[PDB]
Design a protein around this ligand. Structure first.
Ligand SMILES: O=C1c2c(O)ccc(O)c2C(=O)c2c(NCCOCCO)ccc(NCCOCCO)c21
Length: 272
């Protein structure tokens, strides 16, 4: 019933598998259709009702309930050598990496709005028991009309727990120093680090650290003009000691995070 209920369109991307544009024939709902080969899945779990699935599906199902800044799983399918996921697809949309590539460093007011919606989405995941572990500009989509951000690739994710993680499959340049040095981290505080990398990316147009030695050394240089407030939040998230990082709450009460724009106003001003 998969080949019948969706009409396939162009390839959107690959790297996590291959994702195509698609339409639900049922009712013209735009969708993204994502194929993952069994052979390349390292990491499996089980749905409450109990079959053996890719962790990504466990995670997506735990966070796709209700609204939020996560692209929702609408349906999934097993095939003999692959799994296939059907996801929301906002229309039109651009990923943040390509947005930043095209437009360079974001004005603060726009970064503040975007970063805020990222925090709301990640709180939402942490709440649903899910840790993303690969937060970064290419895992974030922009619905250009509504100004709403949406998180996407759960393939390196995990169940959130309070004990140490000794595996990491995400992106190195976004990984915290404790992972580089000890091969251990905790979820929240690792995620905060990656948030601080992301915020630097948004306001400087590029990631701050490229090599292991710079991650570990953790000194941040600004190549672009950034308010003292923005710089201080960033250095805070990128503190070397995990316990010196802010919690989500403290990131959202920081002075740089005041007077955020709603998504709609953000798009009027900045995206049309
Ligand atoms: O993974 C999605 C995606 C998804 O996983 C679930 C729903 C979606 O709507 C998408 C998605 O729209 C998507 C991409 N969309 C076109 C936006 O172009 C990038 C901006 O220049 C462009 C790329 C993309 N995925 C991978 C990003 O990098 C791939 C490099 O070729 C996606």
């Amino acid at each position: 019933p998969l080949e019948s209920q969706y009409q396939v369109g162009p390839l959107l991307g690959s790297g996590f598998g291959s994702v195509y544009s698609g339409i639900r024939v049922s009712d013209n709902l735009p969708v993204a259709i994502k194929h993952v080969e069994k052979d390349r899945i390292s990491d499996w779990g089980e749905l409450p009702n109990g079959t053996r699935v890719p962790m990504e599906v466990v995670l997506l199902k735990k966070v796709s309930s209700g609204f939020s800044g996560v692209i929702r799983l609408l349906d999934w399918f097993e095939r003999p050598d692959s799994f296939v996921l059907i996801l929301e697809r906002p229309e039109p949309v651009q990923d943040l990496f390509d947005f930043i590539t095209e437009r360079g460093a974001l004005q603060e007011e726009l970064a503040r709005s975007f970063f805020w919606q990222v925090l709301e989405a990640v709180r939402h995941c942490h709440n649903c028991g899910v840790l993303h572990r690969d937060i970064k500009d290419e895992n974030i989509l922009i619905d250009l009309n509504r100004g709403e951000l949406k998180l996407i690739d759960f393939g390196s994710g995990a169940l959130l727990k309070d004990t140490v993680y000794t595996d990491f499959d995400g992106t190195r340049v976004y990984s915290p120093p404790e992972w580089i040095r000890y091969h251990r981290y905790h979820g929240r505080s690792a995620a905060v680090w990656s948030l601080g990398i992301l915020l630097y990316d948004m306001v400087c147009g590029d990631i701050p650290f490229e090599h292991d030695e710079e991650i570990i050394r953790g000194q941040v240089f600004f190549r672009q003009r950034v308010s003292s407030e923005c710089q201080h939040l960033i250095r805070w998230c990128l503190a070397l000691r995990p316990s010196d990082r802010p919690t989500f709450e403290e990131i959202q009460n920081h002075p740089w995070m005041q007077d955020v724009l709603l998504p709609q106003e953000t798009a009027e001003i900045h995206l049309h």
